Amino acid sequence: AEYQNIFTQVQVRGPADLGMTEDVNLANRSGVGPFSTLLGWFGNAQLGPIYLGSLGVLSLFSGLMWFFTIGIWFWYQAGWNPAVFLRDLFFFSLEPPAPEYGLSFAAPLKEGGLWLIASFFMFVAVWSWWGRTYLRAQALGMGKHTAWAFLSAIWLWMVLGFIRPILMGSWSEAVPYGIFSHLDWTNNFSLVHGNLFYNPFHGLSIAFLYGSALLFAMHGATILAVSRFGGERELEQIADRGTAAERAALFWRWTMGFNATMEGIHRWAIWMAVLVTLTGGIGILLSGTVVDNWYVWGQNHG
Amino acid sequence: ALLSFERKYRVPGGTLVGGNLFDFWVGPFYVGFFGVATFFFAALGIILIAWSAVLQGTWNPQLISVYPPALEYGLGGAPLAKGGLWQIITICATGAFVSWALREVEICRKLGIGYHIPFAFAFAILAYLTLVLFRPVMMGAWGYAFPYGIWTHLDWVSNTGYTYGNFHYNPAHMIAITFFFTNALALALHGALVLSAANPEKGKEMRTPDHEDTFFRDLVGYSIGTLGIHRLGLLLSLSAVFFSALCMIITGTIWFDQWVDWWQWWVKLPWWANIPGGING
Amino acid sequence: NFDLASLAIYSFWIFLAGLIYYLQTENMREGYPLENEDGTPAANQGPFPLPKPKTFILPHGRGTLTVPGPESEDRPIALARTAVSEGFPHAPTGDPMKDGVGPASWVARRDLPELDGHGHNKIKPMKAAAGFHVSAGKNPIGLPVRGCDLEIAGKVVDIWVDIPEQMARFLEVELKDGSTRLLPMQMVKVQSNRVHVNALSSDLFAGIPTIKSPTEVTLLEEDKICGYVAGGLMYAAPKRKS
Ligand code: BCL
Ligand code: BCL
Ligand code: BCL
Ligand code: BCL
Ligand SMILES: CC[C@H]1c2cc3[nH]c4c(c3C)C(=O)[C@H](C(=O)OC)c4c3nc(cc4[nH]c(cc(n2)[C@@H]1C)c(C(C)=O)c4C)[C@@H](C)[C@@H]3CCC(=O)OC/C=C(\C)CCC[C@H](C)CCC[C@H](C)CCCC(C)C
Ligand SMILES: CC[C@H]1c2cc3[nH]c4c(c3C)C(=O)[C@H](C(=O)OC)c4c3nc(cc4[nH]c(cc(n2)[C@@H]1C)c(C(C)=O)c4C)[C@@H](C)[C@@H]3CCC(=O)OC/C=C(\C)CCC[C@H](C)CCC[C@H](C)CCCC(C)C
Ligand SMILES: COC1=C(OC)C(=O)C(C/C=C(\C)CC/C=C(\C)CC/C=C(\C)CC/C=C(\C)CC/C=C(\C)CC/C=C(\C)CC/C=C(/C)CC/C=C(\C)CC/C=C(\C)CCC=C(C)C)=C(C)C1=O
Ligand SMILES: COC(C)(C)C(=O)C/C=C(\C)CC/C=C(\C)CC/C=C(\C)CCCC/C(C)=C/CC[C@H](C)CC/C=C(\C)CCC=C(C)C
Ligand SMILES: CCCCCCCC/C=C/CCCCCCCC(=O)OC[C@@H](O)COP(=O)(O)O
Ligand SMILES: CCCCCCCC/C=C/CCCCCCCC(=O)OC[C@@H](O)COP(=O)(O)O
Ligand SMILES: CCCCCCCC/C=C/CCCCCCCC(=O)OC[C@H](O)CO
Ligand SMILES: CCCCCCCCCCCC[N+](C)(C)[O-]
Ligand SMILES: CCCCCCCCCCCC[N+](C)(C)[O-]
Ligand SMILES: CCCCCCCCCCCC
Ligand SMILES: CCCCCCCCCCCC
Ligand SMILES: [Fe+3]
After folding, report:
1. What is the DSSP letter of A27?
2. Ligand 1: which residue has its CA nearest to atom 60?
């Protein structure tokens, strides 16, 4: 049953690749970790090294603090009982201050103050991680596309936790930190706003989320179908088109009448994915600030 | 019209049915026997939609809706205007989707490439069939399927979901969502990585795949690699649609309660069901 | 009725249309302008214009690439029209495997090896790659290679490895006459007792194009090799038994 190239047949191992140097401060690179044969069946077997500078340390510290602040609250909700902790783990919730406190930072610890403290830690962790994605690319002389795309995900997170609560007048509009509680929040959000299915920016966000799975299925399958001509070596196929790039393009031209280039498909890809959270963020931003009822708003505009 | 490099690929052969009878192109489009079959099912399905739009009495595309038969019709045939057009359109849509996949196979053969693409497309057909065929038949009526209208099929989604409480609690639905999110994350990362290597900082030469691996190792300590990322993209998108169909085929067939109940097993196990405090004691 | 939400959604649709026009033109940097089947430019190029040229500076002193630019196959194409009207197949005038047309096609890529980030050859035979070894799965080296006629064409004498990615790309196979050919990893099955190749019969292995150097393979050579092997799926089908 013909080789499908989904799993590697024969793994090979050589000395560890320590990576390109360019302008990277090599002081901050770790050593090499162990090779994983298990990972080697699907992708590369090598683990590490990793780069850990000031921003990465600041990010991991803030992130652990965020995690530990939620965990301490969860233990307190479980009356310090480990069995209650495991039993009710998905039900614990660190909720935002009640609406009475408005945007003040003066909520008592057990009445929303811990939420503000956790949110501060998560704010530092994500933004310093963002700075890291920019500086890691700059140190290798790369384009900044990864930082720009990350900003789109950051935008929706900023709208949910920070910009929309501020525009609403209350931290109590923000999202709680809990497995089940943030699902309940999501469902209540749609009900309170008159059915999010009728928010056109929600509809667009769904088309791009579906579209992202459509496109990666198409692109991943296409590349595997032309890997017998070295198609996954996409950079050199951009610099010097080979029969892999031509057959890939012709498959889609013959199928649906038009096609991409090896470079150009990755522009379709980045935009398809970043538009998910770009449109989503706008849809949430407008809910409650401008539109109270998406269904009723929908009926008066067709 | 041809792409500048296209001529040498436009050879005879590769068809599964019909020999050289349909082995030709219309513009960029390859035809083949299953191109003819696709056109047939598509044309007829679009005619029936037109017919049903007249019966409904509107030309507005946002209002046209072709409904399946009432639950009382069970799995039986229905009159055209009382659910029968929906039944015939579903046959045409199925015919067109399967014909499309087999036309893709013929294109694969003529070009000498792997069959991954029509294989991946088959998962989407399977998910469509889960909602209009497999699940309705297991529940005993065509009316459990969704209507064909831009906005009515969203109403169907909301109606079906809230029937079982907050559908969020369906555990296969959680896994599918995780794959959909992780896929869009991987797609953004992969498109960004390639473009950032092909289009580096001003004043720089093109980067190499080694720079892509170095970037991801510096960032998170691991690079899956150029082949692995395309395998991963395939696996993420297909697993998302697989668990999507799984989460619907079990709803209303082996599960009838609010989905939040499913976890309430974990809550009321006897060695902690009665411990006071927490959330569930 | 013109609230801020209506303004936003109308604005987004204008932006999306501009984005689509930009994306489509970016994807016309290769293969355009469209041609007629005789090679002259086509009258109808569509509603999107060609993009203005962009330049890539290739690493390691390999020059620059500007796209789009004047296109050329830079190889003879052994095919003939089978119809006055357009839309019909062009038929091989010779041996399509040897002439490299159809699914046996190759592209006139640069006759240079792909280089890694450090400027060394990206693909090397294992017997010249200090440190490299098989680490999991069946080591094929010394196994017999079998074609779709269930006859034996030779035996595996090396693996050609992608050094930067630590990946097996080609099996080097020694033929009955003592010469060797490269076989793409993606077109073989490593089994417990043999390597099976469905695309070729044993007697088409010697027609695999040969490389100029025992220790490197150029981009041009890889395309000729991979195109030939893949073309066996259509053109060696007579000799594909059971
Ligand atoms: C998958 C789970 C649910 C469901 C839940 C939702 C939800 C929830 C939403 C949609 C949305 C949409 N869905 Mg629905 N939808 C389902 C099944 C379908 C089927 C089908 C035959 O199975 C189709 C064709 C559609 C089609 C559509 C579009 C009208 C719209 C955006 C989709 C998109 O971009 O996807 C990704 C694909 C692409 C980007 C490629 C292009 C696909 C094109 C645009 C599809 C056009 C179809 C056309 C209108 C109908 C046929 C016309 C022929 C001439 C006969 N849905 C099932 C029942 N769907 C969203 C919306 O805005 O609805 C108004 C939305 O919010
Ligand atoms: C009853 C429930 C409601 C509903 C309520 C909502 C609400 C409320 C929201 C959505 C939103 C979304 N909905 Mg809806 N939704 C419903 C029905 C659907 C259906 C369906 C078939 O019925 C579908 C397919 C969708 C689909 C979607 C997505 C397109 C969109 C989220 C995009 C995304 O990637 O977010 C995931 C991505 C993020 C949240 C960004 C995260 C970025 C940050 C920076 C990550 C930090 C990581 C942190 C540090 C932890 C690190 C861990 C360590 C690495 C280990 N909805 C119904 C109508 N939906 C969102 C939206 O945009 O709406 C317009 C939204 O807020
Ligand atoms: C978009 C509209 C809603 C929303 C609706 C939904 C729905 C609906 C679902 C989820 C699901 C999940 N959501 Mg949510 N979600 C929202 C915003 C968030 C934010 C955020 C920063 O804003 C975060 C961190 C999460 C986090 C999560 C995960 C727990 C889970 C899978 C995410 C995923 O696929 O990541 C992709 C990224 C990765 C896989 C990389 C690794 C990420 C890790 C796993 C994130 C860890 C978070 C947290 C620390 C985990 C604690 C685990 C133990 C309990 C200690 N959501 C908004 C408010 N989310 C699904 C689920 O399983 O829920 C239980 C689900 O069904
Ligand atoms: C109030 C509503 C409920 C709810 C109820 C449901 C129900 C009910 C279902 C889902 C399903 C889904 N939900 Mg839910 N869901 C909710 C909230 C969410 C949230 C969220 C952020 O809160 C998210 C992210 C999701 C996510 C999802 C996905 C896992 C899944 C949809 C994808 C799918 O099946 O594709 C599958 C893909 C397809 C069906 C597309 C098939 C396309 C075919 C093959 C080709 C079409 C060709 C076209 C006609 C041709 C066009 C021609 C061109 C125009 C030229 N839901 C809330 C709690 N959800 C659905 C599901 O799993 O279905 C299996 C489903 O039915
Ligand atoms: C285009 C939209 C999609 C998107 C894109 C996107 N996300 C991104 C990026 C991009 C382009 C990045 O560049 C960035 C990244 O670095 O990816 C590798 C990121 C990323 N998106 C992430 C998550 C994420 N993205 C999501 C969504 C989306 N991301 C969209 C679908 C979701 C959800 C809910 O769907 C999640 C959960 C992270 C993997 C990463 C951002 C990392 C970050 O900000 O970290 C700050 C916090 C910490 C460093 C510490 C947190 C504390 C924890 C206890 C973990 C640390 C413990 C230990 C050190 C690690 C242990 C666990 C395992 C990883 C080993
Ligand atoms: C499995 C992973 C994802 C996936 C993959 C995927 N889809 C694919 C492929 C792949 C690999 C293709 O090769 C194929 C393609 O050619 O893409 C360009 C396809 C494709 N996926 C498409 C759509 C699509 N895929 C979707 C989803 C997904 N596709 C998954 C998430 C969705 C949604 C809602 O998520 C949609 C809308 C098409 C662009 C294309 C299939 C084209 C096709 O089949 O053409 C033949 C059919 C016609 C020309 C018309 C038939 C008309 C009917 C007779 C009448 C209308 C019936 C319909 C039920 C009415 C619906 C009304 C709606 C409002 C509900
Ligand atoms: C690395 O690689 C990669 C590339 O490449 C380098 C790529 O590109 C791509 C491809 C990806 C992209 C281009 C990115 C953009 C794509 C998306 C965003 C995905 C979303 C897709 C869409 C929204 C487009 C979908 C459009 C579709 C589905 C096609 C629409 C269909 C039609 C308009 C017609 C369909 C044609 C049919 C039915 C088949 C048969 C053809 C006919 C016309 C019918 C037959 C007609 C007849 C019977 C007449 C016969 C006449 C006779 C008898 C007389 C003789 C005739 C003669 C004159 C000869 C990927 C993934 C890739 O990773
Ligand atoms: C044994 O247990 C120990 C103690 C070790 C543990 O650590 C246990 C740990 C756990 C059990 C982990 C539990 C963690 C979770 C359940 C995480 C679940 C979280 C979510 C589902 C997140 C949902 C969405 C979160 C959002 C939207 C956050 C928004 C953040 C804001 C954008 C930040 C806004 C900033 C503010 C308000 C501060 C203002 C200050 C400035 C300087 C601006
Ligand atoms: C206040 C918090 C929110 C901040 C802003 C939210 C919205 C941000 C949206 C971001 C998406 C940007 C497009 C993603 C793809 C990027 C394609 C591109 O071309 O990017 C420009 C970049 O190549 C320029 O050259 P380099 O920087 O050298 O790479
Ligand atoms: C009312 C209107 C509201 C919205 C306003 C704009 C609407 C019209 C705009 C449509 C076109 C959008 C094009 C976005 C992409 C542009 C990217 C670009 O040209 O610069 C980035 C540059 O580094 C090149 O990318 P790389 O080569 O990858 O670094
Ligand atoms: C210590 C090791 C722990 C590792 C934990 C990982 C952190 C979580 C991220 C997951 C997203 C993975 C998706 C990978 C997306 C890569 C984008 C891409 O194109 O990579 C191809 C390859 O890397 C080109 O060299
Ligand atoms: C970058 C790729 C572009 C894909 C375009 C997808 C179009 C989907 C349109 C969905 C319509 C949503 N809504 C609410 C405006 O009707
Ligand atoms: C929903 C997103 C799809 C947008 C489709 C963009 C269509 C591009 C058609 C370009 C025509 C190319 N052609 C045939 C002239 O070579
Ligand atoms: C959203 C609908 C997209 C359909 C685009 C089809 C365009 C086919 C191009 C071939 C023209 C000759
Ligand atoms: C009277 C029974 C017909 C109802 C429609 C069934 C859906 C057809 C599925 C695909 C069959 C080829
Ligand atoms: Fe790619």
Report:
1. G
2. A203
- CA B248 to ligand 15 centroid distance, Å: 19
Looking at the fold, whether B213 and B223 belong to one and the same domain comes out as yes
Q: How many domains does one find in chain C?
A: 2
In chain B, residues with a C-beta closer than 8 Å to the C-beta of A222 are 116-117
3-class DSSP assignment, residue B61: coil
Q: Is B39 on the interface with A (CB under 8 A)?
A: no
Taking the Cβ of residue A118 and every Cβ of chain C, the question of whether any pair is shorter than 8 Å is answered with: no
Closest CA to B163 of B139, B134, B179: B139
User: Which structure tokens are listed for C68?
Assistant: 């789009």
| Secondary structure of A256-296 in HEC code, one letter for each residue | HCCCCCHHHHHHHHHHHHHHHHHHHHHHHHCECCCECCHHH
Residue A271 near chain C (CB below 8 Å): yes
The distance between the two most distant Cα atoms of chain B, rounded to a whole number of Å, is 77
Residue closest to B29 by CA, chosen among C87, C44, C89: C87
Alpha helices in chain B (DSSP H): 32-56, 84-111, 116-129, 135-139, 152-163, 171-198, 209-220, 226-249, 260-267
Tell me which residue range forms the domain holding C8: 4-92
Instruction: State the count of interchain CB pairs (< 8 A) between A and B.
Output: 319
C-alpha dist (Å) from residue B178 to A63, B73, B216: 21, 37, 22
Q: Is C129 in the same domain as C187?
A: yes
Contact A78 CB / ligand 2 (< 6 Å): no
Tokens at C140, concatenated: 């094929």
Looking at the structure, do residues C124 and C87 belong to the same domain, yes or no?
no
Distance B208 CA to ligand 13 centre (A): 30
Q: Pick A3's closest partner by Cβ from C56, C130, C188.
A: C188
Region class of B104: left (phi > 0), else alpha (psi between -120 and 50), else beta = alpha
Choose the final residue of a domain: B122, B148, B163: B163
Resolution in A: 2.1
- Chains touching A (3+ CB pairs < 8 Å): B, C
Number of domains composing chain B: 2
Rg of chain A in Å (alpha carbons): 24
Distance B218 CA to ligand 11 centre (A): 11
Written as six digits, the tokens of B65 are: 């809706």
Per the structure, the count of domains in chain A is 2
Of the candidates B114, B232, B275, the beta carbon closest to that of A225 is on B114
Residue numbers of A between 12 and 41 with CB closer than 8 Å to C? 12-15, 17, 20, 35, 37, 40-41
Kindly report the backbone phi and psi dihedral angles of residue A229, in degrees, each rounded to the nearest multiple of 5, phi listed first. -115, 20
Measured CA to CA, the distance from residue C106 to residue A76 in angstroms comes to 68
Report how far residue B231's alpha carbon sits from residue B217's, in angstroms, rounded to the nearest whole number: 19
Same domain, B105 and B141: yes
3-class secondary structure, C218: coil
How were these coordinates obtained?
X-ray
Listed residue (C149, B101, B213) closest to A235, CA to CA: B213
Tell me: do C79 and C134 sit in the same domain.
no
- Dihedral sign computed on CA atoms, order B84, B85, B89, B92: positive
